[PDB]
Amino acid sequence: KLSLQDVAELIRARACQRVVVMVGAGISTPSGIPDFRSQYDLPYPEAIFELPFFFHNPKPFFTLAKELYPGNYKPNVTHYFLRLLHDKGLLLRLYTQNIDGLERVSGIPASKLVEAHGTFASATCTVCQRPFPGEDIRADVMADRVPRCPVCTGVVKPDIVFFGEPLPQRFLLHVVDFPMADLLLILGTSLEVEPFASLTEAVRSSVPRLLINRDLVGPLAWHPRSRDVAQLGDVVHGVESLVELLGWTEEMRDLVQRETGKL
């Protein structure tokens, strides 16, 4: 049975050198973004990403769109731990279900990212499926107008994966990434949503999987593997503990201050 210190030692020995990371809304609330367990007028949290409610009333979803359209929110320490993981040549890939875009803003290259639940850089008509590039609807959204298709009149929607829609093709990189991974990090996600959650199962059986979350629930709780490790608590604090045990608190402070100075 492994410790969180044990894990950091693996990294410092470089015994773990192709690290893949699944993250969720956990890691972005320290920045101001809502996680949908909670102000927004929905009959229940999930309707913001459901197609029937979206057609009935797209207004809450476009409220959240307007909040997230960039430059409002900054990345916090969890993002920069991922960016530094990259900078140190350790990040094989970072799989996210967030649509706040701060993984990019922290300086992680699109190359190293899989925005598994979509992006705002593109939109699709809800009825005729004509694609449009992002900015072409952005202004509409920033002025509380609902954008419609100039072909069929359909509401056109940002390319956010709702419940019932397929995941983006870039997600299929997991078929290549997970069997190469020597360490899985799960950061700030209750893993409530498939097929994303199922990825925890797709690393090799000797691969350590470290959860830094509030709760230990779902797949990792049910069918756990010997070299699993859970740092339960507030995600930021857990990360900062890992960082100190790594040696990186100092250059972490430097990186955060440098970047937050840039922005």
Partner: peptide, 11 residues
């Protein structure tokens, strides 16, 4: 790793 559309995990 599973396939399919985005959906709720079965408890």
């Amino acid at each position: 790793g599973k396939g399919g559309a985005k959906r709720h995990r079965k408890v």
